[PDB]
Design an enzyme around this catalytic site. Structure first.
Site, PDB file in Angstrom:
ATOM      1  N   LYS A   1      -5.524 -35.630 -14.308  1.00  0.00           N
ATOM      2  CA  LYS A   1      -6.554 -36.202 -13.456  1.00  0.00           C
ATOM      3  C   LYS A   1      -7.861 -36.834 -14.166  1.00  0.00           C
ATOM      4  O   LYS A   1      -8.494 -37.640 -13.620  1.00  0.00           O
ATOM      5  CB  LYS A   1      -7.363 -35.135 -12.310  1.00  0.00           C
ATOM      6  CG  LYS A   1      -6.275 -34.255 -11.848  1.00  0.00           C
ATOM      7  CD  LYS A   1      -5.939 -34.524 -10.422  1.00  0.00           C
ATOM      8  CE  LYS A   1      -5.558 -33.580  -9.442  1.00  0.00           C
ATOM      9  NZ  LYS A   1      -5.066 -33.837  -8.114  1.00  0.00           N
TER      10      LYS A   1
ATOM     11  N   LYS B   1     -11.552 -33.183  -6.744  1.00  0.00           N
ATOM     12  CA  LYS B   1     -10.061 -32.747  -6.715  1.00  0.00           C
ATOM     13  C   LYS B   1      -9.786 -31.705  -7.635  1.00  0.00           C
ATOM     14  O   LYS B   1     -10.866 -31.127  -8.344  1.00  0.00           O
ATOM     15  CB  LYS B   1      -9.406 -34.109  -7.138  1.00  0.00           C
ATOM     16  CG  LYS B   1      -9.393 -34.501  -8.482  1.00  0.00           C
ATOM     17  CD  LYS B   1     -10.418 -35.889  -8.839  1.00  0.00           C
ATOM     18  CE  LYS B   1      -8.735 -36.645  -8.872  1.00  0.00           C
ATOM     19  NZ  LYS B   1      -8.687 -37.585  -7.382  1.00  0.00           N
TER      20      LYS B   1
HETATM   21  C1  LIG Z   1      -7.713 -34.162   0.219  1.00  0.00           C
HETATM   22  C2  LIG Z   1      -7.990 -32.957  -0.607  1.00  0.00           C
HETATM   23  C3  LIG Z   1      -7.042 -32.541  -1.712  1.00  0.00           C
HETATM   24  C4  LIG Z   1      -6.462 -33.762  -2.383  1.00  0.00           C
HETATM   25  O1  LIG Z   1      -7.202 -34.562  -3.226  1.00  0.00           O
HETATM   26  P1  LIG Z   1      -6.739 -35.546  -4.553  1.00  0.00           P
HETATM   27  O2  LIG Z   1      -7.875 -36.277  -5.057  1.00  0.00           O
HETATM   28  O3  LIG Z   1      -5.568 -36.307  -3.926  1.00  0.00           O
HETATM   29  O4  LIG Z   1      -5.923 -34.584  -5.667  1.00  0.00           O
HETATM   30  C5  LIG Z   1      -7.681 -31.552  -2.527  1.00  0.00           C
HETATM   31  N1  LIG Z   1      -8.486 -30.523  -2.077  1.00  0.00           N
HETATM   32  C6  LIG Z   1      -9.141 -30.746  -0.894  1.00  0.00           C
HETATM   33  C7  LIG Z   1     -10.165 -29.872  -0.505  1.00  0.00           C
HETATM   34  C8  LIG Z   1      -8.838 -31.833  -0.059  1.00  0.00           C
HETATM   35  O5  LIG Z   1      -9.493 -32.196   1.240  1.00  0.00           O
END
Ligand SMILES: *Cc1c(COP(=O)(O)O)cnc(C)c1O
Ligand SMILES: Cc1c(NC(=O)NC(=O)c2ccc(Cl)cc2Cl)ccc(OCCCC(=O)O)c1C
Ligand SMILES: Cc1c(NC(=O)NC(=O)c2ccc(Cl)cc2Cl)ccc(OCCCC(=O)O)c1C
Ligand SMILES: *Cc1c(COP(=O)(O)O)cnc(C)c1O
Lengths: 816, 816
Positions: free
Chosen positions: B553, B547
């Site tokens: 985070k 992420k």
């Molecule tokens: C799904 C996605 C996100 C969101 O991820 P989180 O863990 O909710 O912050 C961010 N970047 C990409 C490439 C994704 O596929």
């Protein structure tokens, strides 16, 4: 319908379904929401489909046979629209006409939607375009190499009689003819410095810009040959143009990419004028650097570079691509490690230079400090070239110390400069003029010292125009009646037009030739009211002068005559005079103040003349807005009188003159450039020549030009000058034209007054002839029937045999 | 082969000839020189051909039936590649696979050539992309409106362990999916001033920028519906951006066009962080201004705007497009001449706002002087909106003077600012959170005063992901075994996954589910060596946290655990521990120093751990470079353990968590965002929950967070901190990580130490379970079988019914 090809049953059906295929799948539109622009694109894609098959086999052919390749380097390619020209060369025009008709559309209406590829300024750029067409038609393995400007020559707008410039965003809606080739993307270097190591010099710490090529097809006339025009686009690398770290801003780094890409952003709008701006130099090195790498890569496939000249020929269109000489040396010496002398031998044998003008202000003299900063290694090579060349001179002319400094590629003075023309002559095995007279002037004047050193290098290759776009395309009506009598072979063999001489007394032909000219004039007169609105009389003599606005072209001399005609009508209102519609069109470079003042004068004259009730319909003065290739295709076939009145010795050749002669217009002009060979071909009795010859201009310069003398001895001229001075043509701003008057009287480099008397006298003779339709038309037949020599097919055949060493061929390539 | 559709005899034949058609006519290539990139394009065009028929009838359908239209305004659309997703939704995958196979090509190899459409930063942009897919699949007349950046999210490069950013030139080789529509080009105004006349205010003397739209198709899942995503491109007008005369330079004027066009040049790479730059504001007004004009033009066709809300619904994805509120008012009042109150009624009824975060630094507060200069009229309207709103407040809470200033859209202080979130709540009829907990926090905390004034506006709509791209596309193996047992209906009805609960004790299923996970891990482990090179053990537990890099985070909390594991192995080398490959990936915003320091820490840990011989293959620390949508499709199906460890109350919802749960990974995380509803759906016994709950964090804040306390009472934590401080992980630069240590000890806003003990204890439990394959897999089945609620089809059905007022439909549109 005419001889625009056959409308085969199978092919009209096939064309329609492919038109619909594209309208659906390509434009994603449905008949109910398709705009005329969508229809134009569906047709363009359908037509383009027909030549891809041939394009592929032509390129594959050259690879298998491996003939000598001709590379035409030019910073300009004035192409214009390409839909019709492609239909013509493929014999698709009628089929397409029929097919679109059945689909309920007007092909001509759709053709007007295409944007002009105005990647040129005037003559020099249009020549390159005509040449491309001829090289394809003559089956030569030729490539046109240039820059893909996203903004071509500006669109001209007239506001309150003044020219207004506006960006030519010709790519706005897309270009269906080009195709990006991101596989042959190449890197080009700028700035940096030179490191001299143990085994050679190294160009180091350079800024890199990428060159992305875009290929556009160039179809030959009905021979199944499709050559390629490769245009380079500047692209910033994603690394350093972001990777050179340590603060600045990430957003800024990305936005700053439009700095390296600015190299291919716009064409410089200068016609026959040199502006030493760094951006210009960058464009020049950019197209040269990329093109050479591509040329050598192709050759390496086909490492003894001894055979290089046997497989490669690169033609320099003026001195714009002159860096190709020191750049070829750089690669051969620095990268390929060839000894200087072997490298020089190869370089001279593959390069050839074409001169386009003798005016000093058009000469490229780049300040040394500029080359020193931008291309440090090239400057070193140019100094070395100069050194060895001057040694050759000294050995040939011992003690001639003045000749040494005169011939040097390096000019001393205020700021040191590099004379690019001297560089080109030294590193080319052939240097040519563009017309017999211009070529002679090069040997006698400008390049005399070079001619004395190496006479064998100097040649002549009179310019020409393509009969396809300049006749069949723009004047199908004339092309048809000619074909009715002598056949279609003349389209690729213009000399056959002489056969028309035997119809000079033919009553039917005389009537036809005159009829197409009348139909052409009615169509143009209509177009005038349609798109520009304000009526003209189609029964009058169409007096037109269309070309870039320049002092040497003397649009001003044309103006004096127009004012004279007006003044004579006002003097004797009820006297009969042959009605005339004089049309003057052309663009002025944005920084050319005098040229912009002249456009204002022309519109100012029209304001007075066009609203004078005593004048009636006997005289109209019209300024043709945004003159360009597509507009030329409309006015030329409609012209009666072609104005080619430059001061003797200034117009190197000219090509518009040849366009008019081929389309049924009579020429009034001076013994300048190609005008001499045209009169010589048609017979001086069939030409309206006047004014000073080169010799007369020189005699005048010896004694000294004094405009006052002419002002003093000619009452009609004096009257005109006093009209401009008193504000007769500019009531609200009485002194508006003081700069023009001042110039004319005190600093006229082109002696406008000196040719005034002989000019209006000669104009009287054309009016006299126009009063005799039958004889006017018979003289027209003598010009047309005798224009064959001015086809670019003849010019190219000569370049091919006398400079490139290749044999033209009219052999059809093995079908598509 | 699987259920990627049928490989019909007629359709595989048809596909092949169209592949060849395009390879020949479109790419102008021949099999002997075609590059893999050409093959990818021929396939893309062939696949795109299949949906144009449907795209046209879908759009034509909406015109005839005229349903209420849903407009999704977002400055981000994180789409990723689109070839496969299109084949999937059209049931073309097998046919295409077969056809390319017979042509002797590997479809998968070609799919990797497509560039990601990385027009998003993270969660917010991917949501919009998932939503588009669901709206099409649910047959809603929806349009995604955004900005067509030529540069999307930067490509991440790791140099010496540091992140290096580089331009994402995704359009370099062209985009076969989009189609420019230069017929709907619109003008957008900037700057200027306001003139107050007799009958209304006038926005005057503005600078104009053109907005050119590009449409990309959005196909629904197997229902023949293809909606449209319209992305705006900034273009400079050719006049004033040249016509504003009186010296400056013609060349310069043309080059300066790249100033108005810089608006759509690049995406701001900030994830959950507000940067008040003028360029950002310009992009925000630009997409809003253009989109509204287009929306109203469509409506005028379909002037009583009373029915406007009945035909139009515009959803605001965060406060980025918040200018749509005062812009709708401007048009309605200034241009359409509606009275304020009628205009406001219409505006509130058509607008709805979605909140995505509660962190203050992510809140959009635009300085008044900026709005004042760039959008003078909008500022006037915002002040008027604020005035009337605060009057509503005062009337509801008489004397509550503190509430008045708290609720004002205008914030006083250093520099006045406009709180965009307050603007959105005031001018929208619905405001929603993205997860039950986040939605509650909005009502209890951040927007408490607004909730008290209008409780009816606040709602919840838990996020979701599309099962098409996030299962069928990336995990065909898992999708297949599931379909073998329960059919294919679950792809558009994820709730049916519950039926899998009855196979939880099935010996065959348990073996299959475990087999696909093993195949997925082997494929990823291979991909790792292929494109990044340096081996990993596929038999270990795949511990992945992917992420964007953020302090909230807590990638740092993950790091402490990794160092702990390493330290324990070094203490008792010959003790058995479950092998783990922990993978951490993600991009840090270029200006986020701490986030970039964390990436360096991760790579620094890997340098030590990955080369320690005593550790062997029991522990590998890998940093996943350039994490993006296409990379997510590879790691997620291969993960065993999903890390969702943000501090309770900071992650609004999250969506990556749902992606992992659907693909067979077990989740270790805090009771944050959607993690709560996932555990609640799967049963807390099937989840690895740990750490503080929101309440615990608040209690800690009341008393005061002191990281020293934890450092003092936990020897293992102390040891780690002293390792970082002494340079154990950075030998050459011993104090390299002082900023991280300093922060952790003195300014940790996210109390990393507070959750350390419970985190490593919980990690022990997952390792214990992993030691029991059968039970691990059985718990996995409980997560998968219970993930149905997190499909965006459910989220959209709720937005549709509870906010937009439209009824979803799974009806197949009448064939193509
Ligand atoms: C799904 C996605 C996100 C969101 O991820 P989180 O863990 O909710 O912050 C961010 N970047 C990409 C490439 C994704 O596929
Ligand atoms: C929208 C639409 C169409 N639409 C397309 O062809 N094409 C598009 O909408 C379209 C155009 C470009 C791109 Cl990139 C994508 C699409 Cl989907 C066709 C017919 C039609 O009914 C007309 C009835 C008669 C009439 O009243 O004209 C309607 C309504
Ligand atoms: C140049 C060429 C081709 N060339 C094209 O398809 N295509 C092009 O050249 C081409 C590509 C893009 C554009 Cl915009 C215009 C053209 Cl004309 C095909 C076959 C071939 O022989 C291969 C023999 C086997 C081998 O040795 O590979 C050769 C030589
Ligand atoms: C032929 C042509 C030229 C050259 O005209 P000259 O009269 O030789 O200067 C310039 N511009 C256009 C549009 C042309 O077609």
């Amino acid at each position: 319908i005419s001889v625009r090809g056959l409308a085969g049953v199978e092919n009209v059906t096939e064309l329609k379904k492919n038109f619909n295929r594209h309208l659906h799948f390509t434009l994603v539109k449905d008949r109910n929401v398709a705009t005329p622009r969508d229809y134009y694109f569906a047709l363009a894609h359908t037509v383009r489909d027909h030549l891809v098959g041939r394009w592929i086999r032509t390129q594959q052919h050259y690879y298998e046979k491996d003939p000598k390749r001709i590379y035409y380097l030019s910073l300009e390619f004035y192409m214009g629209r390409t839909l019709q020209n492609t239909m013509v060369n493929l014999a698709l025009e009628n089929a397409c006409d029929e097919a679109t008709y059945q689909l309920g559309l007007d092909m001509e209406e759709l053709e007007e939607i295409e944007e002009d590829a105005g990647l040129g300024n005037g003559g020099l750029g249009r020549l390159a375009a005509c040449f491309l067409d001829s090289m394809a038609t003559l089956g030569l393995a030729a490539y046109g190499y240039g820059i893909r400007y996203e903004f071509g020559i500006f669109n001209q707008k007239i506001c309150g009689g003044w020219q207004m410039e506006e960006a030519d965003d010709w790519l706005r809606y897309g270009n269906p003819w080009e195709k990006a080739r991101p596989e042959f993307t190449l890197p080009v270097h700028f700035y940096g410095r030179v490191e001299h190591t143990s085994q050679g010099a190294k160009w180091v710490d350079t800024q890199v810009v990428l060159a992305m090529p875009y290929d556009t097809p160039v179809p030959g006339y009905r021979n199944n040959v499709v050559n390629t025009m490769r245009l380079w686009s500047a692209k910033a690398p994603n690394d350093f143009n972001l990777k050179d770290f340590n603060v600045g801003g990430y957003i800024q780094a990305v936005l700053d990419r439009n700095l390296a890409e600015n190299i291919s952003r716009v064409l410089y709008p200068n016609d026959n004028f040199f502006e030493g701006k760094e951006l210009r130099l960058k464009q020049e090195y950019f197209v040269v650097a990329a093109t050479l790498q591509d040329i050598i890569r192709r050759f390496k496939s086909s490492t003894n570079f001894d055979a290089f000249p046997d497989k490669v020929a690169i033609q320099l269109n003026d001195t714009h691509p002159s860096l190709a000489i020191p750049e070829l040396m750089r690669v051969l010496v620095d990268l390929e490690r060839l000894d200087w002398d072997k490298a020089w031998e190869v370089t001279v044998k593959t390069c050839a230079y074409t001169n386009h003008t003798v005016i000093p202000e058009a000469l490229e003299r780049w300040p040394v400090h500029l080359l020193e900063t931008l291309l440090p290694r090239h400057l070193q090579i140019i100094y070395e070239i100069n050194q060895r060349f001057l040694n050759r001179v000294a050995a040939a002319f011992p003690g001639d110390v003045d000749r040494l400094r005169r011939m040097s590629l390096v000019e001393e003075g205020a700021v040191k400069r590099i004379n690019m023309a001297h560089l080109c002559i030294a590193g080319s095995h052939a240097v040519n003029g563009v017309a017999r007279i211009h070529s002679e002037i090069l040997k006698k004047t400008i390049f005399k010292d070079f001619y004395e050193l190496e006479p064998h290098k100097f040649q002549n290759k009179t310019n020409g125009i393509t009969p396809r776009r300049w006749l069949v395309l723009c004047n199908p009506g004339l092309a048809e009646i000619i074909a009715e009598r002598i056949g279609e072979e003349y389209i690729s063999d213009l000399d056959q037009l002489r056969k028309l001489l035997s119809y000079v007394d033919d009553e039917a032909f005389i009537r036809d030739v005159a009829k197409v000219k009348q139909e052409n004039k009615l169509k143009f007169a209509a177009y005038l009211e349609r798109e520009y609105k304000v009526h003209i009389n189609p029964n009058s003599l169409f007096d037109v002068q269309v070309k870039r606005i320049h002092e040497y072209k003397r649009q001003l001399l044309n103006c004096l005559h127009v004012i004279t005609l007006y003044n004579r009508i006002k003097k004797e209102p009820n006297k009969f005079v042959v009605p005339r519609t004089v049309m003057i069109g052309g663009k002025a470079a944005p920084g050319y103040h005098m040229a912009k003042m002249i456009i204002k004068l022309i519109t100012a004259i029209g304001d007075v003349v066009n609203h004078d009730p005593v004048v009636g319909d006997r005289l109209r003065v019209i300024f043709l807005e945004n003159y360009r290739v597509s507009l030329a295709e409309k006015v030329i076939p409609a012209a009666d009188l072609s104005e080619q009145i430059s001061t003797a010795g200034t117009e190197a050749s000219g090509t518009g003159n040849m366009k008019f002669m081929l389309n049924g217009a009579l020429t009034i002009g001076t013994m300048d450039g190609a005008n001499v060979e045209m009169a010589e071909e048609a017979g001086e009795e069939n030409f309206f020549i006047f004014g000073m010859r080169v010799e007369d201009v020189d005699r005048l310069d010896q004694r000294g030009y004094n405009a006052q003398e002419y002002y003093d001895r000619i009452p009609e001229l004096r009257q005109i000058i006093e009209q401009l001075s008193s504000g007769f043509f500019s009531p609200k701003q009485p002194d508006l034209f003081k700069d023009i008057v001042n110039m004319l009287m005190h600093h006229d480099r082109f002696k406008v007054f000196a040719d005034y008397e002989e000019y209006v006298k000669c104009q009287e003779r054309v009016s006299a002839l126009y009063k005799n339709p039958r004889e006017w038309t018979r003289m027209v037949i003598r010009n047309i029937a005798t224009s064959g020599k001015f086809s670019s097919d003849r010019t190219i055949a000569q370049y091919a045999r006398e400079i490139w060493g290749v044999e033209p061929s009219r052999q059809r390539l093995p079908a598509p």
